[PDB]
Structure formats: C-alpha cells, structure tokens
Amino acid sequence: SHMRVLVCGGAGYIGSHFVRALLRDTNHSVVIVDSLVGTHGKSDHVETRENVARKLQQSDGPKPPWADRYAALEVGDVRNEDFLNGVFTRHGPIDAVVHMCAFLAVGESVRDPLKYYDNNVVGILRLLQAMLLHKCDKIIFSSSAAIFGNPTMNAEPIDINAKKSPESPYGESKLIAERMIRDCAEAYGIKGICLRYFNACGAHEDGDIGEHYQGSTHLIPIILGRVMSDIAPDDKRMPIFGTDYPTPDGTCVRDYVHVCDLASAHILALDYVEKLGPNDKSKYFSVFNLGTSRGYSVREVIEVARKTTGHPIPVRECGRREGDPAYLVAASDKAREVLGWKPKYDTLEAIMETSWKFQRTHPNGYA
Amino acid sequence: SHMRVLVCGGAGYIGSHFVRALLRDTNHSVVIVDSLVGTHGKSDHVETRENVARKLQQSDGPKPPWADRYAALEVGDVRNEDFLNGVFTRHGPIDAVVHMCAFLAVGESVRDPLKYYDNNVVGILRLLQAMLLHKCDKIIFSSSAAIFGNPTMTNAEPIDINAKKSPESPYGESKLIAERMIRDCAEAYGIKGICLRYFNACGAHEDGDIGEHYQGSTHLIPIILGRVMSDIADKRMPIFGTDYPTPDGTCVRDYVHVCDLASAHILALDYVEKLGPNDKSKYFSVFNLGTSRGYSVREVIEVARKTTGHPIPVRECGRREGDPAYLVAASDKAREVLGWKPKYDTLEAIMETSWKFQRTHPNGYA
Ligand SMILES: NC(=O)c1ccc[n+]([C@@H]2O[C@H](COP(=O)([O-])OP(=O)(O)OC[C@H]3O[C@@H](n4cnc5c(N)ncnc54)[C@H](O)[C@@H]3O)[C@@H](O)[C@H]2O)c1
Ligand SMILES: NC(=O)c1ccc[n+]([C@@H]2O[C@H](COP(=O)([O-])OP(=O)(O)OC[C@H]3O[C@@H](n4cnc5c(N)ncnc54)[C@H](O)[C@@H]3O)[C@@H](O)[C@H]2O)c1
Ligand SMILES: O=c1ccn([C@@H]2O[C@H](COP(=O)(O)OP(=O)(O)O)[C@@H](O)[C@H]2O)c(=O)[nH]1
Ligand SMILES: O=c1ccn([C@@H]2O[C@H](COP(=O)(O)OP(=O)(O)O)[C@@H](O)[C@H]2O)c(=O)[nH]1
Structure with a gap:
C-alpha cells in the first residue's frame, strides 16, 4: 500500500x-x-x-x-x-x-x-x-x-x-x-x-550497519569496544555504573x-x-x-558478551549514573495483539551475536 | 534591595x-x-x-x-x-x-x-x-x-x-x-x-486605572461585567456546564x-x-x-449582580472542554515560607475593584 x-x-x-x-x-x-x-x-x-x-x-x-x-x-x-x-x-x-x-x-x-x-x-x-x-x-x-x-x-x-x-x-x-x-x-x-x-x-544480519562503539554511550557498544581494545596490541576494564540498585544482583535491569x-x-x-x-x-x-519482556542486568549482559566474543572483559564497579531507573522491562501484549508484532529475537545471545558480527568487522566504524 | x-x-x-x-x-x-x-x-x-x-x-x-x-x-x-x-x-x-x-x-x-x-x-x-x-x-x-x-x-x-x-x-x-x-x-x-x-x-488596583477590559476577554468576571456594560455603555451571560460534580453543578474556582x-x-x-x-x-x-475560598460560576454571577445592580440574565450552556470541576488553593506554604498575607478574602471586595475599573473604562485603555 x-x-x-x-x-x-x-x-x-x-x-x-x-x-x-x-x-x-x-x-x-x-x-x-x-x-x-x-x-x-x-x-x-x-x-x-x-x-x-x-x-x-x-x-x-x-x-x-x-x-x-x-x-x-x-x-x-x-x-x-x-x-x-x-x-x-x-x-x-x-x-x-x-x-x-x-x-x-x-x-x-x-x-x-x-x-x-x-x-x-x-x-x-x-x-x-x-x-x-x-x-x-x-x-x-x-x-x-x-x-x-x-x-x-x-x-x-x-x-x-x-x-x-x-x-x-x-x-x-x-x-x-x-x-x-x-x-x-x-x-x-x-x-x-x-x-x-x-x-x-543488535545489528542487521548483513553485518554492515550498527552502532559503532566510538562515541557511544550505550552498554553493549561500550562492552564490545573494550574487546576491540583487548584485541588490539597491548584502564581497559568495563565500567559498571552502580551496584547498589534494588535489583537481584544490584545492577540495572533492562x-x-x-x-x-x-x-x-x-x-x-x-x-x-x-x-x-x-x-x-x-x-x-x-x-x-x-x-522482549525479558530482562538482563548489567552483569548478565557482560557475561553474555564474554561468551559471545570469547574474551575476558575485565570489569570495574563504579557509582551510579544519574538518571537511571533500576528496572525497565516491557510488557508488549498490546503491540502483539493490536499491531500483530512478532519479534524474531528473544534471547540476548542471538542479539549479541549480530552486534558482535557488525563491530568485529568495523574497527573504525563506517569510516 | x-x-x-x-x-x-x-x-x-x-x-x-x-x-x-x-x-x-x-x-x-x-x-x-x-x-x-x-x-x-x-x-x-x-x-x-x-x-x-x-x-x-x-x-x-x-x-x-x-x-x-x-x-x-x-x-x-x-x-x-x-x-x-x-x-x-x-x-x-x-x-x-x-x-x-x-x-x-x-x-x-x-x-x-x-x-x-x-x-x-x-x-x-x-x-x-x-x-x-x-x-x-x-x-x-x-x-x-x-x-x-x-x-x-472523597x-x-x-x-x-x-x-x-x-x-x-x-x-x-x-x-x-x-x-x-x-x-x-x-x-x-x-x-x-x-x-x-x-x-x-x-480584581483591579484600587486606583481604578488598570485591569482586564471585557472586550476580547475569555475570563468569567470580565465577561460578566461586559454584559453589564454592553447593556448600558443572545446578549445573555453563558454558564459553561451545569452538570459538574460540584454542589450546584457549575465549576468552582x-x-x-x-x-x-x-x-x-x-x-x-x-x-x-x-x-x-x-x-x-x-x-x-x-x-x-x-484565597482558599471557592465560588461556583452561579455564585460569582450572584456577587456581580449585587455589586453592579444589574439583573445579568443568564443562559445555561454545555461544558467548555479543558475545565476541571474544582480548583481551590491551600496556601499554607506561601503563608508559612514566603510570609504571604493576602488583603482580599471574599469576592465582594474583589468584585468591587473589578467593577470600579470596568465601569469607568467603556473602551478599555483606548
Ligand atoms: N537507542 C536506544 O536504545 C533508544 C531507546 C528508546 C528510544 N530511542 C529513540 O530512538 C530514536 C533514534 O535513536 P538511535 O539510537 O537511532 O540514535 P541516533 O543518534 O543514531 O539517531 C538519531 C538521528 O537523529 C538525528 N538528529 C538529531 N537531532 C536532529 C535534528 N534536530 N534534526 C535532524 N536530525 C537530527 C541524528 O543525526 C541521528 O542520525 C531517538 O528518538 C531516540 O531517543 C532510542
Ligand atoms: N489570568 C489568570 O487567571 C491566570 C491564572 C494562572 C496563571 N496565569 C498566568 O499569568 C501570566 C500573565 O497572565 P495575564 O492574565 O496577565 O495575561 P496577559 O495576556 O494580560 O499577560 C501576558 C502578557 O504576555 C505577553 N506575551 C505573550 N507571549 C509573549 C511572547 N512570546 N513574548 C513577549 N511577550 C508575550 C502578552 O502581550 C501579554 O501582555 C501568564 O503566564 C498566565 O498563563 C494567569
Ligand atoms: O559503560 C557503561 C554504560 C552503561 N552502563 C549501564 O547499562 C544500563 C543501560 O545503559 P544504556 O546507556 O546502554 O541505555 P539506557 O538504559 O540508559 O536507555 C544502565 O544501567 C547504564 O548505567 C554501565 O554500567 N556501564
Ligand atoms: O462566559 C463564560 C466564561 C467562563 N465561564 C466559566 O467560569 C469558570 C472560570 O473560567 P475562566 O476562563 O474565567 O478562568 P479559568 O478557570 O479557565 O482559569 C470556568 O468554569 C468557565 O467555564 C462561564 O461559565 N462563562
């Protein structure tokens, strides 16, 4: 139409x-x-x-x-x-x-x-x-x-x-x-x-477009960026913003x-x-x-990145980043019922794989 | 300072x-x-x-x-x-x-x-x-x-x-x-x-030289006083909504x-x-x-009638969308923290200053 x-x-x-x-x-x-x-x-x-x-x-x-x-x-x-x-x-x-x-x-x-x-x-x-x-x-x-x-x-x-x-x-x-x-x-x-x-x-399955880590403020791109630095010839630790949140492991759930x-x-x-x-x-x-209605804490996301990249990803616990709610997970019944939305990705493992495929082939982003 | x-x-x-x-x-x-x-x-x-x-x-x-x-x-x-x-x-x-x-x-x-x-x-x-x-x-x-x-x-x-x-x-x-x-x-x-x-x-300053002229106004009192003016200086005063969850059915302010x-x-x-x-x-x-005191639209019109001495005929209309039923203030903090002391309490005295300004300004500041 x-x-x-x-x-x-x-x-x-x-x-x-x-x-x-x-x-x-x-x-x-x-x-x-x-x-x-x-x-x-x-x-x-x-x-x-x-x-x-x-x-x-x-x-x-x-x-x-x-x-x-x-x-x-x-x-x-x-x-x-x-x-x-x-x-x-x-x-x-x-x-x-x-x-x-x-x-x-x-x-x-x-x-x-x-x-x-x-x-x-x-x-x-x-x-x-x-x-x-x-x-x-x-x-x-x-x-x-x-x-x-x-x-x-x-x-x-x-x-x-x-x-x-x-x-x-x-x-x-x-x-x-x-x-x-x-x-x-x-x-x-x-x-x-x-x-x-x-x-x-995540990133398109083609592996040609995505969020490059350089200049990014988001969790996963930053984690993968730390790996892009661990890959390169010898603080490169992954920063965890706040570990004192009202969540199961203390870190923000998303x-x-x-x-x-x-x-x-x-x-x-x-x-x-x-x-x-x-x-x-x-x-x-x-x-x-x-x-996806499923939540992962910052710690859990880093653990998935470790298993996806096969790297150590040394961490480092820091204080909270102002403006962050402790928990944000979605109930998508309306989208599913009214729009007929059917998400193809459910686990972070599969999503992370597409993010890594894009990043690991783009050391300098689109440049 | x-x-x-x-x-x-x-x-x-x-x-x-x-x-x-x-x-x-x-x-x-x-x-x-x-x-x-x-x-x-x-x-x-x-x-x-x-x-x-x-x-x-x-x-x-x-x-x-x-x-x-x-x-x-x-x-x-x-x-x-x-x-x-x-x-x-x-x-x-x-x-x-x-x-x-x-x-x-x-x-x-x-x-x-x-x-x-x-x-x-x-x-x-x-x-x-x-x-x-x-x-x-x-x-x-x-x-x-x-x-x-x-x-x-409630x-x-x-x-x-x-x-x-x-x-x-x-x-x-x-x-x-x-x-x-x-x-x-x-x-x-x-x-x-x-x-x-x-x-x-x-209201208006006691001097009676400044205020809200009725021509082009969207507010209640200036509109009521304008109805009194037009008659002297429908033509009926409209009441927007009479089915509100209030004592007399009209909005309280x-x-x-x-x-x-x-x-x-x-x-x-x-x-x-x-x-x-x-x-x-x-x-x-x-x-x-x-002032912490509330007056319904009906009560305000009633005060205007006494203040002006004009009949102020009315016609009930439907609600004006966007209007809450009741809006009255508790001014404890203003009084306690700022030391605010309002000189006007009841609407009669306030209405008097509004009328004093309007009746002497048939054409506003013009
Ligand atoms: N990334 C997330 O996790 C996330 C989550 C919830 C909502 N959003 C929203 O989704 C939208 C896109 O996010 P994104 O991750 O793709 O970010 P992005 O920065 O990659 O995309 C935003 C685009 O908008 C452009 N832009 C910004 N201001 C502009 C302006 N004034 N005039 C013209 N172009 C302008 C930027 O150049 C950029 O290309 C944003 O509205 C964002 O707030 C993102
Ligand atoms: N009148 C009420 O009952 C009431 C109640 C609560 C809050 N307020 C607020 O009090 C303030 C004054 O209300 P008022 O009754 O004196 O109204 P008013 O229209 O007489 O005063 C507003 C003045 O601001 C000017 N103005 C508007 N946009 C402007 C702009 N973009 N740049 C420069 N000047 C601009 C207008 O020319 C006007 O002189 C407003 O912010 C209003 O929302 C009024
Ligand atoms: O280097 C980082 C970047 C982000 N975060 C956290 O990861 C979660 C997601 O942050 P992001 O900026 O990626 O997205 P947001 O939830 O703010 O929309 C939040 O708790 C962030 O504080 C973190 O611990 N270390
Ligand atoms: O001609 C009018 C003008 C206003 N009102 C009502 O009087 C109250 C106060 O309205 P106003 O616009 O003067 O101030 P507001 O309460 O919207 O800030 C509201 O219930 C209005 O619907 C009315 O009944 N007739």
Missing part, C-alpha cells in the same frame, strides 16, 4: 534499520531528513541512490529483489522551519512522518537539560506544525522506556499505561512529546502512534530488543494508522511498549 | 499590577519585555518614563513617594533570540527574571495545542537559555492551577502544592512542563526558581486579587535573593496562590 514516508533521524542507528526494512519489505517511498549530528557528519551508510548503486556494483552475485530500492536524503535540522518546509514541498505529498531524531544520552540530559528540551521538544513541535501546514495526518514517534522511571517512591514487565515518573530530562522530553501528539489528535485529527522502545541493540524487530513494528504501526478512518477517532492516538 | 528585574509579559493584566507594586513598594530596577500581543499592540497603560510623567502633570497635590518611579519597556517576542539577547545586554546585569508571558485561554488551548506549546514552552526555554548565557540565576515563573486538573477519584478540599498533576488541557500541560524544565535547571546549573501557581486572578498576587512575587524575589550555596534543596520551590 504505497505511501510517501518522511523519516526524521533516518540516518541514525535505529533509523538505518527501519529504512532498510522499508526498502526491502514495503513499497513505500522514503525520504530521510537528518542533520548528521549523530553520525559524525557523514552519510556513507545511508542507502541513497548512489550508495545503493556502489554496493550492488562493488559486489557480485545474484541481484537482490531490492537492488533498485533507495531513499532520498535531505541533510538539515528539523528545527530549521525553512529547510523543513522545503522538504515537505519538494518531496510532497508526505503521507506519514516517522519522527526518530533526538539526543538520547540519559546521563548527559541530567547534566545539560536545555540541550535535550530544545532538540527533543522543539524538534517534535516543528514537525507537528509542518504536518498541519502540509496536510499530513499521520505520525509514528520514537518514544522511550525512560518516560516511566522508577515506581512511585515487585519489578515486572511495564504496561503501556503504567505511571509516568521520568528519572531524567531525556525521559521528560519524550513524555511531553507524547502529550503534544495526543492533543493534536483531538484538535487537528492527527493520527499518532508513540512506540516506547526499550533497550535497542530489556534488550533487536533493532530489526523494532523496525518491523514501525511498518506495522504505519499500516495501522493508514487504515484509521473518521469513526475511529478514539483510536487516533495510541501507544505501544516494544521489548 | 536594589535588584534589576526583567519582567516578561509585564505589559499584561497581572504584569501591570506586579510592575506597579515593584515601582511603589520596592527599590528594584524594572525592565519590561512584552510583544504586546495580549494588549492589542498598545502600551499606553505601561508605566514607562513618559507615561508616568503625564500622570504627574495631570495630578493635583503633593507628589507621592513613587511619583518619579518608572519601568523600561522593550517591545518584542521573547522567542526572538537576537531581541532577547539585546535586552539582557543593554539592561544588564539582570539579577532576576519574572516570566509572565504566555497564551492562557484554556478553552482555546484544547482546540489549538501547538499555539500553546510553542509560545508557552519555547518561551520559557529561551528565557532559561538566556539566563544561562548572561549569568542570571534567579527566576519567578507564572504557573497555574491548571497543572492539577481533576483529582484521581471530600473536595483546597489543593496542596504537591497534589497529583493531571492537566485537563494543553495549557495546563505547557505550564507543567515549564516547571519540570525550571526544576532540572536548578540541579544542573544552579538556577534558583520559584513557580507560583496563581489560581483565578481577578478560587478568585485571588491581582494585588495580592503581586505582593507574593515581591516576597518570592526576596526569597530567592537570600538563597546561598547551603540551600541547594531550596533552589527549586513551588507555591499555590489563592
């Missing part, structure tokens, strides 16, 4: 996996708008017309059914209202917006709130205003488990409607965005879906969901909003928690 | 009363920044150097202690970076910011959320960024009872500062996010902030005089100015400002 999709932040980690799924599993037209602030100012990995061509060229073998599928790339900031307007006009009519751009280092948001409120909140504001101006009535928003925080001061899978008590400015910025999108449904008829990803991880499963959820979300009609209205705004 | 104060939205209804209190009851320097979007693009009422000299000229009798006091006026949008930065630079150093600008029609925020999220949220964001850039560490923010919304399922009692926040409108959401942004700036940059939740602002709100800001300014390195836990504070 062809549809022209505008993917903000599409050159990023999760965005690249979503775009690839759009290009290989759908007939939608893809337009990416990214400032490249989260990609070191480069876009060699983006599946533009030229990049896709070079890939099919440099390599030999049966031409894939998606060999001619590519996305357009518009480089700029979504807060630059002029730039944004030009993108909607030149690539219009835009049927749906998938808003993935943001700053997402929870620890950094606590130290520099304004950087996060500006980019995260003003960014979604500008998109919503552009959608209204250009008659676009469908949006899929990248939310987070960070909107939940710790229980109001049993730890079990978090439901979509659990209380929202953000433990960081990052979480607050995602939460206000959901409120804004919700209010636009009632006021302007904008159909929106907020997908709360939990801990995104739900690691594969980026390819997150990608398929967006395709299902797009089909859902596209089928909504005027009688649905109460269904114009919906939220879904995306996770 | 000679402090230079930047008052955003200072040309407005509540801002004008706060500025007058600053000029007559303090020795602070006042700089007003306002786009005049809420004042019909005019500022004849603002107590600038010129406007104040005209009052003096027309006045007969000995000069008051505050005869020559005036405020500077910078006309522009706080969301305009170049403009805001220029104001901080030319009038600097700015010691404290009193952020009063915003759009505040609860009913309109439900119909047009983006207009409110933009102005209300981006406005406070720019001010906080400017404060950081220009080394300003003190801010007093105009919050609202709208951040509370309805109670989660006994309807005055609302405590830490009651659950369940905004019933985008307007309430915009005020709430501003409080969380200010709070996070305390922890991160050492910015000392106070969020004053005004409840239903009403806490009407607090703008002059009492003004004195609370002066007390708030003193509170943040006295904060030091040891008072980290006090860098972010919130206070609910109300």
Whole structure:
C-alpha cells in the first residue's frame, strides 16, 4: 500500500534499520531528513541512490529483489522551519512522518537539560506544525522506556499505561512529546502512534550497519569496544555504573530488543494508522511498549558478551549514573495483539551475536 | 534591595499590577519585555518614563513617594533570540527574571495545542537559555492551577502544592512542563526558581486605572461585567456546564486579587535573593496562590449582580472542554515560607475593584 514516508533521524542507528526494512519489505517511498549530528557528519551508510548503486556494483552475485530500492536524503535540522518546509514541498505529498531524531544520552540530559528540551521538544513541535501546514495526518514517534522511571517512591514487565515518573530530562522530553501528539489528535485529527522502545541493540544480519562503539554511550557498544581494545596490541576494564540498585544482583535491569524487530513494528504501526478512518477517532492516538519482556542486568549482559566474543572483559564497579531507573522491562501484549508484532529475537545471545558480527568487522566504524 | 528585574509579559493584566507594586513598594530596577500581543499592540497603560510623567502633570497635590518611579519597556517576542539577547545586554546585569508571558485561554488551548506549546514552552526555554548565557540565576515563573486538573477519584478540599498533576488541557500541560524544565535547571546549573501557581486572578488596583477590559476577554468576571456594560455603555451571560460534580453543578474556582498576587512575587524575589550555596534543596520551590475560598460560576454571577445592580440574565450552556470541576488553593506554604498575607478574602471586595475599573473604562485603555 504505497505511501510517501518522511523519516526524521533516518540516518541514525535505529533509523538505518527501519529504512532498510522499508526498502526491502514495503513499497513505500522514503525520504530521510537528518542533520548528521549523530553520525559524525557523514552519510556513507545511508542507502541513497548512489550508495545503493556502489554496493550492488562493488559486489557480485545474484541481484537482490531490492537492488533498485533507495531513499532520498535531505541533510538539515528539523528545527530549521525553512529547510523543513522545503522538504515537505519538494518531496510532497508526505503521507506519514516517522519522527526518530533526538539526543538520547540519559546521563548527559541530567547534566545539560536545555540541550535535550530544545532538540527533543522543539524538534517534535516543528514537525507537528509542518504536518498541519502540509496536510499530513499521520505520525509514528520514537518514544522511550525512560518516560516511566522508577515506581512511585515487585519489578515486572511495564504496561503501556503504567505511571509516568521520568528519572531524567531525556525521559521528560519524550513524555511531553507524547502529550503534544495526543492533543493534536483531538484538535487537528492527527493520527499518532508513540512506540516506547526499550533497550535497542543488535545489528542487521548483513553485518554492515550498527552502532559503532566510538562515541557511544550505550552498554553493549561500550562492552564490545573494550574487546576491540583487548584485541588490539597491548584502564581497559568495563565500567559498571552502580551496584547498589534494588535489583537481584544490584545492577540495572533492562530489556534488550533487536533493532530489526523494532523496525518491523514501525511498518506495522504505519499500516495501522493508514487504515484509521473518521469513526475511529478514539483510536487516533495510541501507544505501544516494544521489548522482549525479558530482562538482563548489567552483569548478565557482560557475561553474555564474554561468551559471545570469547574474551575476558575485565570489569570495574563504579557509582551510579544519574538518571537511571533500576528496572525497565516491557510488557508488549498490546503491540502483539493490536499491531500483530512478532519479534524474531528473544534471547540476548542471538542479539549479541549480530552486534558482535557488525563491530568485529568495523574497527573504525563506517569510516 | 536594589535588584534589576526583567519582567516578561509585564505589559499584561497581572504584569501591570506586579510592575506597579515593584515601582511603589520596592527599590528594584524594572525592565519590561512584552510583544504586546495580549494588549492589542498598545502600551499606553505601561508605566514607562513618559507615561508616568503625564500622570504627574495631570495630578493635583503633593507628589507621592513613587511619583518619579518608572519601568523600561522593550517591545518584542521573547522567542526572538537576537531581541532577547539585546535586552539582557543593554539592561544588564539582570539579577532576576519574572516570566509572565504566555497564551492562557484554556478553552482555546484544547482546540489549538501547538499555539500553546510553542509560545508557552519555547518561551520559557529561551528565557532559561538566556539566563544561562548572561549569568542570571534567579527566576519567578507564572504557573497555574491548571497543572492539577481533576483529582484521581472523597471530600473536595483546597489543593496542596504537591497534589497529583493531571492537566485537563494543553495549557495546563505547557505550564507543567515549564516547571519540570525550571526544576532540572536548578540541579544542573544552579538556577534558583520559584513557580507560583496563581489560581483565578481577578480584581483591579484600587486606583481604578488598570485591569482586564471585557472586550476580547475569555475570563468569567470580565465577561460578566461586559454584559453589564454592553447593556448600558443572545446578549445573555453563558454558564459553561451545569452538570459538574460540584454542589450546584457549575465549576468552582478560587478568585485571588491581582494585588495580592503581586505582593507574593515581591516576597518570592526576596526569597530567592537570600538563597546561598547551603540551600541547594531550596533552589527549586513551588507555591499555590489563592484565597482558599471557592465560588461556583452561579455564585460569582450572584456577587456581580449585587455589586453592579444589574439583573445579568443568564443562559445555561454545555461544558467548555479543558475545565476541571474544582480548583481551590491551600496556601499554607506561601503563608508559612514566603510570609504571604493576602488583603482580599471574599469576592465582594474583589468584585468591587473589578467593577470600579470596568465601569469607568467603556473602551478599555483606548
Ligand atoms: N537507542 C536506544 O536504545 C533508544 C531507546 C528508546 C528510544 N530511542 C529513540 O530512538 C530514536 C533514534 O535513536 P538511535 O539510537 O537511532 O540514535 P541516533 O543518534 O543514531 O539517531 C538519531 C538521528 O537523529 C538525528 N538528529 C538529531 N537531532 C536532529 C535534528 N534536530 N534534526 C535532524 N536530525 C537530527 C541524528 O543525526 C541521528 O542520525 C531517538 O528518538 C531516540 O531517543 C532510542
Ligand atoms: N489570568 C489568570 O487567571 C491566570 C491564572 C494562572 C496563571 N496565569 C498566568 O499569568 C501570566 C500573565 O497572565 P495575564 O492574565 O496577565 O495575561 P496577559 O495576556 O494580560 O499577560 C501576558 C502578557 O504576555 C505577553 N506575551 C505573550 N507571549 C509573549 C511572547 N512570546 N513574548 C513577549 N511577550 C508575550 C502578552 O502581550 C501579554 O501582555 C501568564 O503566564 C498566565 O498563563 C494567569
Ligand atoms: O559503560 C557503561 C554504560 C552503561 N552502563 C549501564 O547499562 C544500563 C543501560 O545503559 P544504556 O546507556 O546502554 O541505555 P539506557 O538504559 O540508559 O536507555 C544502565 O544501567 C547504564 O548505567 C554501565 O554500567 N556501564
Ligand atoms: O462566559 C463564560 C466564561 C467562563 N465561564 C466559566 O467560569 C469558570 C472560570 O473560567 P475562566 O476562563 O474565567 O478562568 P479559568 O478557570 O479557565 O482559569 C470556568 O468554569 C468557565 O467555564 C462561564 O461559565 N462563562
């Protein structure tokens, strides 16, 4: 069911996996708008017309059914209202917006709130205003488990409607965005879906795209980066942020969901909003928690990395990183029931293997 | 305590009363920044150097202690970076910011959320960024009872500062996010902030020269008094919703005089100015400002009838979306910590000042 999709932040980690799924599993037209602030100012990995061509060229073998599928790339900031307007006009009519751009280092948001409120909140504001101006009535928003925080001061899978008590400015910025999108449904008829990803991880089976460790603030990429340093010719120990949490082993528990499963959820979300009609209205705004429903502590994740890489990965216990909730695991019944979401990755072992395959073949990232 | 104060939205209804209190009851320097979007693009009422000299000229009798006091006026949008930065630079150093600008029609925020999220949220964001850039560490923010919304399922009692926040409108959401942004700036940059939740602002300065004119107003009392004016200077007074979970079915509110709100800001300014390195836990504070008395829409109209002597015919209508059923304030902390002492209690006295201003201003300030 062809549809022209505008993917903000599409050159990023999760965005690249979503775009690839759009290009290989759908007939939608893809337009990416990214400032490249989260990609070191480069876009060699983006599946533009030229990049896709070079890939099919440099390599030999049966031409894939998606060999001619590519996305357009518009480089700029979504807060630059002029730039944004030009993108909607030149690539219009835009049927749906998938808003993935943001700053997402929870620890950094606590130290520099304004950087996060500006980019995260003003960014979604500008998109919503552009959608209204250009008659676009469908949006899929990248939310987070960070909107939940710790229980109001049993730890079990978090439901979509659990209380929202953000433990960081990052979480607050995602939460206000959901409120804004919700209010636009009632006021302007904008159909929106907020997908709360939990801990995104893994890499596409092809092993060519993923989250490089250099400059990363996330657990697994950092662990694998320590291995990339243990592999190199002779403190390289793996830092554990906080061991005094209200969890079984004292370290934070998270739900690691594969980026390819997150990608398929967006395709299902797009089909859902596209089928909504005027009688649905109460269904114009919906939220879904995306996770495997299984949790792993920081210690357990490191142990899986050790068994996946075959390396020692010496650790070192440190103090808590401000902004971190003790436990964040997802209950995804709504996503499974309503969207028909069917995650292919369940164990961290299989996920970790795809992350390692990508990292171990990219000592310098995409560079 | 000679402090230079930047008052955003200072040309407005509540801002004008706060500025007058600053000029007559303090020795602070006042700089007003306002786009005049809420004042019909005019500022004849603002107590600038010129406007104040005209009052003096027309006045007969000995000069008051505050005869020559005036405020500077910078006309522009706080969301305009170049403009805001220029104001901080030319009038600097700015010691404290009193952020009063915003759009505040609860009913309109439900119909047009983006207009409110933009102005209300981006406005406070720019001010906080400017404060950081220009080394300003003190801010007093105009919050609202709208951040509370309805109670989660009893006994309807005055609302405590830490009651659950369940905004019933985008307007309430915009005020709430501003409080969380200010709070996070305390922890991160050492910015000392106070969020004053005004409840239903009403009344007018005893002088009878400034207030909220009915033409273009979305608020209850100004609209009621406007119905009295139109008849003299349907045409029936509309009651929005009569099926609310209240004693008489209409919304209950806490009407607090703008002059009492003004004195609370002066007390708030003193509170943040006295904060030091040891008072980290006090860098972010919130206070609910109300009389603790509630009046339903029916009761307010009843008071207006007696105050004006006009029949004020009515027509019951449906609910205005975005309205909580009950909003009355418990002001224990404001009284205990700031030493706030409201001079107006009952609505009769308040209504009297509102009527005095309106009846003498058939065309507003025009
Ligand atoms: N990574 C996770 O575990 C996780 C979990 C929950 C939610 N999320 C959310 O998913 C989205 C994507 O995350 P990611 O891991 O792919 O991160 P990422 O940084 O790789 O992707 C974000 C992309 O957005 C771009 N961007 C940022 N601000 C922009 C702006 N103002 N204008 C244009 N482009 C801009 C960046 O250049 C980057 O390419 C974000 O909204 C993030 O908050 C991520
Ligand atoms: N009136 C009430 O009952 C009430 C209750 C609770 C909270 N508040 C808050 O108190 C404050 C003042 O309310 P008021 O009744 O005096 O309203 P008002 O409209 O008279 O005052 C607001 C002033 O801010 C200005 N303004 C708006 N956006 C601006 C911008 N972007 N840049 C520069 N100036 C801008 C307007 O021109 C206006 O002069 C607002 O923040 C309002 O939300 C009012
Ligand atoms: O070097 C690191 C990086 C992260 N973490 C922890 O691993 C968990 C996941 O952190 P991440 O930044 O990868 O994602 P988040 O849960 O903040 O969205 C959290 O408890 C972090 O404190 C850690 O112990 N050491
Ligand atoms: O013409 C009007 C205007 C307002 N109201 C009601 O009076 C109460 C106060 O409304 P207002 O806009 O003056 O202030 P708010 O409580 O929204 O901050 C609310 O229940 C309104 O619905 C009314 O019944 N008729």
